[PDB]
Amino acid sequence: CSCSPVHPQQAFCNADVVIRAKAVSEKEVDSGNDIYGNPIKRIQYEIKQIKMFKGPEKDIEFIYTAPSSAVCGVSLDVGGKKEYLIAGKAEGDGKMHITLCDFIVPWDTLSTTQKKSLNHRYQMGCECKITRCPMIPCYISSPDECLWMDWVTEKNINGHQAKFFACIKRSDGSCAWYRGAAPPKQEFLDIE
Amino acid sequence: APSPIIKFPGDVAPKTDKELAVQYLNTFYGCPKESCNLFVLKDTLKKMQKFFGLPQTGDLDQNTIETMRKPRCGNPDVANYNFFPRKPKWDKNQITYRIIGYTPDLDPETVDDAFARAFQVWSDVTPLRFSRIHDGEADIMINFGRWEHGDGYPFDGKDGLLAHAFAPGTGVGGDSHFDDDELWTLGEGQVVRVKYGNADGEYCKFPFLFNGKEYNSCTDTGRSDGFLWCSTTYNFEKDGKYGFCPHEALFTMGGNAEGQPCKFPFRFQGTSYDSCTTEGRTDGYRWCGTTEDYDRDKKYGFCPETAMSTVGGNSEGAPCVFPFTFLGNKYESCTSAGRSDGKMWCATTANYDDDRKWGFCPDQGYSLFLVAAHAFGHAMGLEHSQDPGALMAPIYTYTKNFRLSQDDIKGIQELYGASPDTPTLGPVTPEICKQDIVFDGIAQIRGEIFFFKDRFIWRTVTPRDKPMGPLLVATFWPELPEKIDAVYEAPQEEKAVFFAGNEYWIYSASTLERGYPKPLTSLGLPPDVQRVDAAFNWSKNKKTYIFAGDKFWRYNEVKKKMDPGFPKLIADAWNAIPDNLDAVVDLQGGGHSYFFKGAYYLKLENQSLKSVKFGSIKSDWLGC
Numbered sequence: 001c002s003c004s005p006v007h008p009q010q011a012f013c014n015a016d017v018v019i020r021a022k023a024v025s026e027k028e029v030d031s032g033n034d035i036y037g038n039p040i041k042r043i044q045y046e047i048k049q050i051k052m053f054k055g056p057e058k059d060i061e062f063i064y065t066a067p068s069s070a071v072c073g074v075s076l077d078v079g080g081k082k083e084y085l086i087a088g089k090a091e092g093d094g095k096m097h098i099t100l101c102d103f104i105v106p107w108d109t110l111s112t113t114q115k116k117s118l119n120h121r122y123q124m125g126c127e128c129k130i131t132r133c134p135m136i137p138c139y140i141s142s143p144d145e146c147l148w149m150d151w152v153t154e155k156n157i158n159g160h161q162a163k164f165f166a167c168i169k170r171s172d173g174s175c176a177w178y179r180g181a182a183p184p185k186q187e188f189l190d191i192e
Numbered sequence: 193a194p195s196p197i198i199k200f201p202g203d204v205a206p207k208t209d210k211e212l213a214v215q216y217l218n219t220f221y222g223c224p225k226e227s228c229n230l231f232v233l234k235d236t237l238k239k240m241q242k243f244f245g246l247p248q249t250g251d252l253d254q255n256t257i258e259t260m261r262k263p264r265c266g267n268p269d270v271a272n273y274n275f276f277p278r279k280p281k282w283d284k285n286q287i288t289y290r291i292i293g294y295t296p297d298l299d300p301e302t303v304d305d306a307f308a309r310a311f312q313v314w315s316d317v318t319p320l321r322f323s324r325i326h327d328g329e330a331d332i333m334i335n336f337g338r339w340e341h342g343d344g345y346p347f348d349g350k351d352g353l354l355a356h357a358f359a360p361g362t363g364v365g366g367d368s369h370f371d372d373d374e375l376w377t378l379g380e381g382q383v384v385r386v387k388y389g390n391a392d393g394e395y396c397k398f399p400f401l402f403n404g405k406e407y408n409s410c411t412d413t414g415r416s417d418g419f420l421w422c423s424t425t426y427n428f429e430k431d432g433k434y435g436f437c438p439h440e441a442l443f444t445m446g447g448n449a450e451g452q453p454c455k456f457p458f459r460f461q462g463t464s465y466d467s468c469t470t471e472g473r474t475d476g477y478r479w480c481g482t483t484e485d486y487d488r489d490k491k492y493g494f495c496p497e498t499a500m501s502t503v504g505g506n507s508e509g510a511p512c513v514f515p516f517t518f519l520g521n522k523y524e525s526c527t528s529a530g531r532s533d534g535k536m537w538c539a540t541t542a543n544y545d546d547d548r549k550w551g552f553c554p555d556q557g558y559s560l561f562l563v564a565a566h567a568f569g570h571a572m573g574l575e576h577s578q579d580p581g582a583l584m585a586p587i588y589t590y591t592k593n594f595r596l597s598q599d600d601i602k603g604i605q606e607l608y609g610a611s612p613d614t615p616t617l618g619p620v621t622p623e624i625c626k627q628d629i630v631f632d633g634i635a636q637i638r639g640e641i642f643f644f645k646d647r648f649i650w651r652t653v654t655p656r657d658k659p660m661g662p663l664l665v666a667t668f669w670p671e672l673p674e675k676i677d678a679v680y681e682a683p684q685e686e687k688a689v690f691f692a693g694n695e696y697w698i699y700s701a702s703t704l705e706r707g708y709p710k711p712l713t714s715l716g717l718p719p720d721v722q723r724v725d726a727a728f729n730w731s732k733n734k735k736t737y738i739f740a741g742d743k744f745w746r747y748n749e750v751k752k753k754m755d756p757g758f759p760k761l762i763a764d765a766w767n768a769i770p771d772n773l774d775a776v777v778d779l780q781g782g783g784h785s786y787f788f789k790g791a792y793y794l795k796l797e798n799q800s801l802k803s804v805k806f807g808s809i810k811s812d813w814l815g816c
C-alpha cells in the first residue's frame with residue numbers, strides 16, 4: 001500500500017460514498033482463493049452508519065479491507081465506539097471497501113470546519129482541480145486550478161490548507177479557496 | 193541639461209569625480225601627493241569598499257564616490273597608529289575633561305550639556321566617570337577649530353570631516369577637536385536660545401508660522417529696527433510667545449555694557465577686533481568692546497551665540513533675497529544652481545551676477561551630541577567600527593532616539609568594566625540572508641523597495657538578485673521608532689505612511705507633518721489600535737487595506753470618511769490570504785499584490801481575487 005497525497009475535498013469528490021460508520025462486531029475475514037491457489041483473505045466489519053454523505057442509497061452494513069496492512073491495512077477498532085467517515089469504494093448492498101490508501105480518519109480528528117464541508121462545501125468544488133505544490137517555487141496557470149502546498153507548510157496530509165480549506169468554483173468557471181460560510185462576493189467595495 | 197559648473201567666491205571647488213577620491217583616499221587610507229599607486233599596484237580603493245558594505249568592483253566611480261561624499265568622522269579607518277599610544281585604554285577610571293573652545297551656533301549652556309550627555313553614553317555602561325575641570329590641563333581638551341587648527345591634521349571647510357580625537361595618552365592624547373565651519377545643532381536644524389520678550393529662556397521653534405509663511409531661522413519681518421525675533425512655538429497667531437535672537441551686532445550679555453552692541457572695530461592692546469574674541473580668556477567665552485577702545489573706556493559684554501539666516505558663503509549670515517538672478521535666470525527659492533555637490537544656496541542680493549553675494553541655506557546641521565559621542569569613544573581608546581548601526585561607525589547618521597550599539601557596548605566594555613555598585617544592549621545588526629528573517633515591513637516607498645527590521649532598511653529598485661544595505665532607518669526618517677510594523681505610501685499624494693505601536697507617522701517630503709504621529713483611533717480603526725500587521729494600496733481599487741489580526745480593515749485614501757462597519761473578517765473578499773500577514777506589496781503594473789507571512793509569499797491577482805505563485809521570500813525577493 002503506497003497511497004498518493006490528496007486534499008480532503010477530492011476525497012468527497014473521487015469517492016463513491018462517504019459516511020461515518022463504526023465496528024460493532026468484525027465480520028471475521030472469511031474464505032477465498034486466487035492464483036497460487038490458497039484462499040483470499042479479507043477483513044470485514046459489522047457497521048452502524050450514522051448518516052450518509054454523497055453516494056448510492058443501498059446503505060453500508062459491513063466494511064471490507066485487504067488482508068494485510070502491508071497491502072492496505074485499514075485495521076480499526078470495535079467495541080470502543082469511535083466513528084469513521086471513510087469513503088471507500090461503494091459496492092452493491094452495504095458493501096464498501098476501505099484501502100489504507102483511502103481518506104480515513106477517526107471522527108474526533110476533523111476540525112469544526114472539516115465536518116461542515118460534508119453537506120455543501122466540498123461538493124461545490126468538484127468541477128475543480130487541486131494542484132499539489134512540488135517545491136517553492138511553484139505556479140498555477142489554468143483559471144480553475146488552486147495551488148495546494150502543504151508539503152511546503154506542513155509536510156503531512158493534515159495541514160492548514162487541508163484542515164480549513166476548500167477550492168470552490170467561481171461564477172466564470174474558474175476556481176478558488178475559502179474559509180467560512182459566506183460564498184457571495186468578489187472584492188469589498190462601496191458605492192462611489 | 194549641460195549643467196553649468198561655477199566657482200563661488202570663498203569656496204575652492206575643483207574636485208572633479210575622481211580628483212576627490214584621490215584627496216579622499218589618503219586622508220583615511222594613507223596615500224599622499226601621488227595619484228594612488230593603484231596603477232601597477234591595485235590597493236587602496238579596495239579596502240575602502242571593504243568598509244561600508246562590500247560592493248567591490250574596483251574604483252566603482254559610479255556608486256562608491258557617493259560614500260566619500262557623506263559626512264564622516266575625521267579619523268582614519270585603518271592603521272590605529274596615528275598618534276595616540278599603542279595601548280588604547282585609559283590607565284585610570286576617574287577621567288577629567290575641559291571645554292576650551294565653544295561654537296557660536298549654540299549657547300554655551302547647550303554645548304556644556306551636549307558634551308556631558310555624550311560622555312554619559314559611555315559612563316552608563318562603564319565604571320568610567322567624567323568630571324569637568326575649569327583649570328589647567330585635563331585628560332580631554334575639547335575645542336573647535338578650522339582648517340589648520342594646531343595639530344597638523346586640517347579640516348576641510350563646511351561638511352566633509354566633522355571632527356576628530358586622539359586616543360588615550362599624554363597631553364594631546366584624548367583631545368577632541370570639532371569642526372568650526374560646520375553648523376552645529378542638536379540634530380534637526382539651526383538652534384537659537386531666545387533672549388527677551390515673553391519666552392526669554394526657550395529655544396526658537398523652527399519652523400514657526402507667522403503671517404501665513406513658515407520661518408526656519410530668526411527674522412526681522414514685522415520689526416522696523418532691524419532686530420531678530422523668532423516665535424517660541426509653531427503657531428504664533430495662537431500662542432504668542434517669542435523672544436529676540438542673539439547677535440553681537442544687535443546686543444550682548446552681561447559684562448558692563450548694559451546690553452549694548454559690539455563696536456567694530458574695537459581696539460584691545462594693539463589689535464583691532466572685528467568680531468568678538470576670546471583673547472584674554474580661558475573659559476573660552478567670546479567677548480567684545482562696546483566702545484571703540486576697550487582699554488581706554490573699559491566697556492564690554494559677552495557674545496554667547498549668533499543667530500543667522502544664511503550659512504557659509506560670503507554674506508556673513510545675511511538672509512536670502514528672493515527673487516534672485518544667477519547665470520541669467522531668476523530663482524525664488526534656494527537652488528543648487530552652479531553647484532555640483534548638491535549643497536543648496538541662495539543669493540543675499542537680488543542679483544548674484546552683479547554682486548556675487550551668496551550663502552548656504554542652512555540645512556539640518558550636525559548634532560554636537562552625537563558627533564561628540566563617537567568622538568569621545570575614540571578618546572576612550574575605541575576605533576572605527578564597520579557596523580552600520582555602530583555609533584563608532586565613521587559616517588554621520590542622525591538618530592533622534594540614539595542608543596549605543598552592542599557593538600559599542602562590546603568594544604568599550606572590552607577595555608573597561610561594565611557597571612559597578614546581568615543586562616546587555618539586546619539586538620544586533622541583522623544579516624541579509626545568512627539567517628532567517630521576518631521583516632517588520634516590506635514596502636514600495638518611491639521607486640525603491642525597502643525591507644524593514646529593528647533599526648534597518650535594505651532596499652532596491654528592480655534587482656531581486658540582491659538588495660542593498662543595511663542602512664539605519666533613521667537615515668531618512670528619524671522620528672521613527674526602533675521597530676516599525678506596517679508601512680505604505682499613498683500614490684494619490686506620494687506620502688510615506690508609517691505604522692507603529694499605538695501611533696502612526698506620515699512623512700511627506702522628508703518631514704513629518706504637524707500633529708502626527710497620532711494614534712490609530714483618529715486614523716479610522718477602533719481602539720484595537722494596540723498594534724498592526726500589514727497595510728498597502730490597491731493596484732486597481734486604489735484604496736488602503738489595513739490588515740490586523742483575523743480581520744482586515746478599509747480606509748478612504750480618496751476621502752477622509754470611513755467605510756460602513758468594518759471590521760469584517762476575511763470571510764468576504766480575501767481568499768488564500770493567511771491570518772495576520774507580515775506584509776503586503778503592490779508593484780508597478782502587473783496587478784499582482786504580494787502577501788507576506790512566515791518565510792514565504794503568496795502572489796495575489798487584483799484583476800481576479802483568487803491566487804497564484806507561492807514562493808520563497810528569501811530566494812525571490814531580498815535577493816539570495
Ligand SMILES: [Ca+2]
Pocket residue numbers: 347348349350351352353354371373374
Ligand atoms: Ca568639515
Ligand SMILES: [Zn+2]
Pocket residue numbers: 265266267566567570576585586
Ligand atoms: Zn571616528
Ligand SMILES: [Zn+2]
Pocket residue numbers: 341343345356369
Ligand atoms: Zn584637531
